[PDB]
Amino acid sequence: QNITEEFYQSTCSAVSKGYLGALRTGWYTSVITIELSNIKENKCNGTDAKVKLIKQELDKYKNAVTDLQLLMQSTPATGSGSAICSGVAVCKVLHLEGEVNKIKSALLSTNKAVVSLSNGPSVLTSKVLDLKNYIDKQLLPIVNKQSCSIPNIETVIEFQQKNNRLLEITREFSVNAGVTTPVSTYMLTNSELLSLINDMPITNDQKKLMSNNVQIVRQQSYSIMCIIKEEVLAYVVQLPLYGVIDTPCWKLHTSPLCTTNTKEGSNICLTRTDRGWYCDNAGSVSFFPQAETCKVQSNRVFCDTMNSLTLPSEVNLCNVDIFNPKYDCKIMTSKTDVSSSVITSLGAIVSCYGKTKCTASNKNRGIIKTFSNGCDYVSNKGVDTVSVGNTLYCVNKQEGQSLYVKGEPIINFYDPLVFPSNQFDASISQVNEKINQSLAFIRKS
C-alpha cells in the first residue's frame, strides 16, 4: 500500500517501511541460437562498388565468425564464479558432441522449443536470427561465380541489416571475455524477452512483475557464450527468478550523532552502522550491504540474495531501542565531528556540528528553519531543498506520511573521556564492555 516513515531521534536514524519486495532466489537459463553459414567464398574478377561492398560485408561476417571461434577456444577467465555456474554448466553440456545436433533437430520447424538434455534439465532453446537461410539463398549464388555478378543495392542493404546484430553480439562477447551484463537488446530483443518471460514456469504475478519492469530484469540477468559448432552460434541467457514477491521491506538511513562542545577535543561521535535495505524473508531479515544489489522501482524493490546476510528479526528493534542487549546492535565511533546530510525516502536527516551553515530553503518561500548543532530530520511535506554548507541536497517529493518517534539522543549518555573513539566498527555489547573495562581502570587508580 502506502509507504510511510519513522524517524528515531534516539538513534539518529530513519526507517522507510511499506515497500513491496521481490528478492532473487533462483536462475532460469535459456539457450538462444543463431543459425550461421559455413562458407568458402571464392575469388572472382570484381571491381564495381557493389561487388566490393558485398565482399567487405562478407569479410566482416567471416572475421566475426572466426573471432567468436577463438573466443571459445581461449575464454578461461570467469567474471563472477558465484553467479554464472548454472549457465556455465549448460555451456559445458553443449560442448559435448551430438548435443548441439540435438538442439539443432528440435528447433527445425519453430523458433522456440524445449529440449531435454542428457543431464536432465529441460531448457528452452530459441532461434532468434537466421543468417544461414539468407546467405545460402540470396548471397552465395551472386558472389561464387567465375566473375562476380553485379548485385543490386537492395541486397547490400538487407545484408548489412541482417549481419549487424551478429557483429554487435560478437563485439559484446569479445570485449567482456564471453560474459556480458546487462543483457542488451542485441543479445535479446524486447519481443523475445517478453515471450521468454511469458513462457517461464513462474506464477502469473511474477510474469506481470518481470514484464512491467523489464529493464530491471535485464539489469539482473547474464548472457554467457557457449560454442560455435556446425554452423550454429549458441549462448545461454540467465534470467532472475523472484521466488518471494510482494514481501515487506525496510530502509535504514544513518547519520553521525555528536556532542555540541566548542572544543573539537571534547566531542565524541557515534553513527549507527549497517545502513541499507532490510527485507522480510521466511520469518527472518535479509540485509543487503552493497548498494547495487537492490534496484528500486516505485513502491517495488528488486534485490539480489547472492551477496547478502541473514539476521534474526530482532535487529529491527535496534531502530527504537539501540541500548537493548536482546540484540547486539552494532555502531561505529570516532572523534570526527564533520557535518553531513542523508536524503531519506520521505525526508532528510541533517547532522550539523561546529562552524557549519545548515539550512532548508524552499523555491517559493525562503529558509523556514536554520538547523542548530545536533542531529535532526525533516519531512518532505512542504520542504523542497536542504542546504549544508556549500552543498545542496534535494528532498524526494513522493507523497506519504512521516511519524516523528521522539526520544533523547543517546550521545548524551556517554562520558567523552573514556569513550572508545578509535574502536571503529563495534557491537553495542562490545562498547558496554569497554566502558566496564574503563571503570575497572579507574577503581584501582
Partner: single-chain antibody, 236 residues
Amino acid sequence: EVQLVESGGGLVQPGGSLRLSCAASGFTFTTYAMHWVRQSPGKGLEWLASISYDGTSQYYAESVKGRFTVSRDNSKKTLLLQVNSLRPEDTAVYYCAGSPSGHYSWLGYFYAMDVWGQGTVTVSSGQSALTQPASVSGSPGQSITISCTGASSDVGGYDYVSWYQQHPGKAPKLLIYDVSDRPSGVSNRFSGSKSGNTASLTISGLQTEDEADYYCSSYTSKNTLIFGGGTKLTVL
C-alpha cells in the same frame, strides 16, 4: 562398400500419397548430403531435391515443388521422400544419391553426386533444361567429344559442371566434378573442359566398356540442379 538402397514402390494408384526412403551403410551419415533423382523409362534424368547434412536447409526443383517434401532422420540413418497427388506422368525409377561435402548447407557446395543406388519403381496406370547430342558414333582407338550446352545461369556463370556414366540398367557413376577434376577409380581417359557456355567431356582410346549413355549437370544460379538429355555412345 558405401552402399545406398532404395525402398517403397511397386504399383500404385494415380492419386493419394506415397512414401519412399533410403538406407545408409558404409559411411558416416552426418557428413553426407542427399539427393533424390528420377528417370522415366527410356528417357533422361531429372533432378528433384537435396537436403543439407543437418536437414535444416532443403531446396527443390521448380517442376516438383510443393507436391514433394524431403525429410531425414539422422538418428535412424535414413532419408525419406513423400509423394502427394501422384500423376500418370510420374511413373519412373527413383534413385537415391549422396554427395561427400559436410558441415555445409548451400546447394553449390554439394552439387555433384558420386554414390548411387539400385532404384525402386513407381508405376501408375489407368524435361531437360540442359541439352546434349544423342547420336555419337565412335570407332575404337579414336577420340570423340560430347557437348553439354547451357546459357550463363547454368555451366556458363559457374565453374560447376559434373559428368556421369550410366550403363543400360544400372546405377550412374561419377566421372568429372568441378570442371575438370575427377574422383578415384576413374580412368585417365576421362577428362572434361569448359569454354564459355558449353562444357565438353572428352574420351580417347575408346574401348568396349565405354558404349553407354552419359549425362551432365550444373548448378543453376536459381539454387537448383539441371540435368541434360543423355548421349548414346556406339563403339564399332
